[PDB]
């Protein structure tokens, strides 16, 4: 009953609508993030999901108290009765504050008036991605947040600890399938708007895409299609149906592979690294088809070799047997050295 009396005194005359220190000082809000699980990064929508314990701490002299306990730990129902920062994510997109079983938010009021207001959020924040280097790309996905109604002269945000140590990611929270969270770097800036200047806390999560999935899904099938185009070189020239089926198969297969590569990506007007890889692979297979046509022009005799004249093995085929694997290997070395070595 004593604690109920204290809470009644705290809310007696309290004005939910006015920030702490209105007309006296700026309201400094020290903010922290404990990423419970870095949720899946949706490249198609250029957004990422992150599950966080978003903590906020600010001093409110109205909520100063003296009692048997130094820290009143309270449920979410008290939070709605007090002023809390109107924080929002500048790049947020359809976040959710979890409700099960109860509203997942804690409040702790220290006897000096300091508040600790934490909430469990699943935030789908926008991450603009420049996919030129995709799939070897690295992305500094931001999470900008700040007040909506309060300008820098009204509410200022701060990190509760050192900026390096104020965003902690759990060891087992990595829900990334095709990404590796290298780390996070934080900063604080100012944004100019039609309504005023707003303090914006930015934290960039540095993600490096894991190329293994695309190695198995795209690069290996493309390489195998190229090699399937080159077995046609090794085959004899007279088997026109055989090599025709081979080359047409390889070209159509590379067509469907190219389309399967694009639909896995968000739409963009520029070509990614895999688009260039597929373009050169398509050039190789189409060159194999053109090579087959070239040798087919000089196929004087339609009948195949038997153990009567006989066709000689095509010179173009013999040079191709070495050139195509050498050009393709040199291209692979150049490509992988160009992108892998990059920072």
């Amino acid at each position: 009953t004593v604690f109920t009396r204290i809470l009644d005194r705290l809310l007696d005359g309290y004005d939910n609508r006015l920030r702490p220190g209105l007309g006296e000082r700026v309201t400094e809000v020290k903010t922290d993030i404990f990423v419970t699980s870095f949720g899946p990064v949706s490249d198609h929508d250029m957004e990422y999901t992150i599950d966080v314990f978003f903590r906020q701490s600010w001093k409110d002299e109205r909520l100063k108290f003296k009692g048997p306990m130094t820290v009143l730990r309270l449920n979410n129902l008290m939070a709605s009765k007090i002023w809390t920062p109107d924080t929002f994510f500048h790049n947020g997109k359809k976040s959710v504050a979890h409700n099960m079983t109860m509203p997942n938010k804690l409040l702790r009021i220290t006897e000096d008036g300091t508040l600790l207001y934490t909430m469990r959020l699943t935030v789908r924040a926008e991450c603009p991605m420049h996919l030129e280097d995709f799939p070897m790309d690295a992305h500094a996905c931001p999470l900008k947040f700040g007040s909506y109604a309060y300008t820098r002269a009204e509410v200022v945000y701060e990190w509760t600890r050192e900026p390096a140590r104020s965003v902690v990611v759990a060891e087992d929270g990595s829900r990334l399938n095709q990404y590796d969270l290298l780390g996070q770097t934080v900063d604080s800036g100012i944004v100019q708007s039609s309504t005023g200047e707003y303090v914006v806390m930015t934290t960039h999560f540095h993600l490096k895409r894991k190329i293994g999935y695309f190695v198995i899904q795209t690069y290996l099938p493309c390489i195998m299609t190229v090699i399937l185009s080159q077995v046609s070189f090794w085959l004899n020239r007279e088997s026109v149906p055989a090599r025709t089926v081979f080359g047409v198969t390889t070209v159509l297969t590379m067509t469907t592979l190219s389309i399967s590569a694009r639909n896995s990506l968000p739409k963009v007007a520029y070509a990614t690294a895999m688009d260039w890889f597929i373009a050169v692979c398509y050039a190789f297979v189409f060159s194999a088809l053109i090579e087959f046509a070239t040798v087919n022009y000089f196929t004087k005799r339609g009948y195949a070799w038997d153990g009567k004249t006989f066709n000689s093995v095509s010179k173009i085929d013999r040079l191709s047997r070495i050139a195509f694997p050498l050009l393709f290997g040199i291209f692979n070395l150049v490509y992988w050295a160009t992108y892998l070595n990059r920072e």
Epitope: E158, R165, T185, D187, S188
Partner: antibody, heavy 117, light 105 residues
Framework: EIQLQQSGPELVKPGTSVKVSCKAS????????MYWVKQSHGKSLEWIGY????????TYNREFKGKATLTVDKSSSTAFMHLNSLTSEDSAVYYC???????????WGQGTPLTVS | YIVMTQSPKSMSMSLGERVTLSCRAS??????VSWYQQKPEQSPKLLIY???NRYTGVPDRFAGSGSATDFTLTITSVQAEDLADYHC????????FGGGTKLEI
């Protein structure tokens, strides 16, 4: 006008401990962390550790870990640094700094020359 | 910790001339870099908090800017009172101040 008042210079021989105080008056002591820095003669400033006055949570430098003990007095509103196992290398000038936020140290102490020989 | 390096350990600038300093950080420190002024036998005095912002009560001539790692402080014109040692410190991680630069005549 915030003014961090440190103690005067100390004379001491090696192998004994010293206590250097830092008194703040303008601002309320508990609101902001207190940092201790030492600048060896003609060298760069060197951070030794900081203490959150409200709950006395303290963090030290790895180089100075275990050599300096930081404490606070709410009633006296004063931060104390206790140096143990003094050596000739310790000779330097200490300051206490006030961290307004994670952008700058707003005020600094006058400086307490430590002499050991 | 983070290592802060100042390239021109000592330079002489004619009175009234523009003088520019430099401060380097080992790795990312964001905008969390401050510039302080230490006159002989005096405590440091804050000049430029953050990458660009200037502390209250400081002459307008002081002004600095920097990227994530490199930083610079520029004085529009040196004055007799401006002769002192200039430090650069960072607060992105635990504090670690730089070597410091000294100006003469």
């Amino acid at each position: 006008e915030i003014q961090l008042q440190q103690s005067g210079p100390e004379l001491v021989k090696p192998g004994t401990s010293v206590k250097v105080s830092c008194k703040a008056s303008g601002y309320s002591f508990t609101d902001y962390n207190m940092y201790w820095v030492k600048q060896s003669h003609g060298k760069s400033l060197e951070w030794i550790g900081y203490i959150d006055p409200y709950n006395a949570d303290t963090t030290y430098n790895r180089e100075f870990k275990g050599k300096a003990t930081l404490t606070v007095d709410k009633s006296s509103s004063t931060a104390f640094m206790h140096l143990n196992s003094l050596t000739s290398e310790d000779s330097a000038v200490y300051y206490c700094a006030r961290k307004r936020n994670n952008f700058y140290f707003d005020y600094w102490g006058q400086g307490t020359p430590l002499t050991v020989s | 910790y983070i290592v802060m390096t100042q390239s021109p350990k000592s330079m002489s600038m004619s009175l009234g001339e523009r003088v520019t300093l430099s401060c380097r950080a080992s790795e990312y420190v964001g905008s969390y870099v401050s510039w302080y002024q230490q006159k002989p036998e005096q405590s440091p005095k804050l000049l430029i908090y953050g990458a660009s912002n200037r502390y209250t009560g400081v002459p307008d001539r002081f002004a600095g800017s920097g990227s994530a790692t490199d930083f610079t402080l520029t004085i529009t014109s040196v004055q007799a009172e401006d002769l002192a040692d200039y430090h650069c410190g960072q607060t992105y991680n635990y504090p670690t101040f730089g070597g410091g630069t000294k100006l003469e005549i």
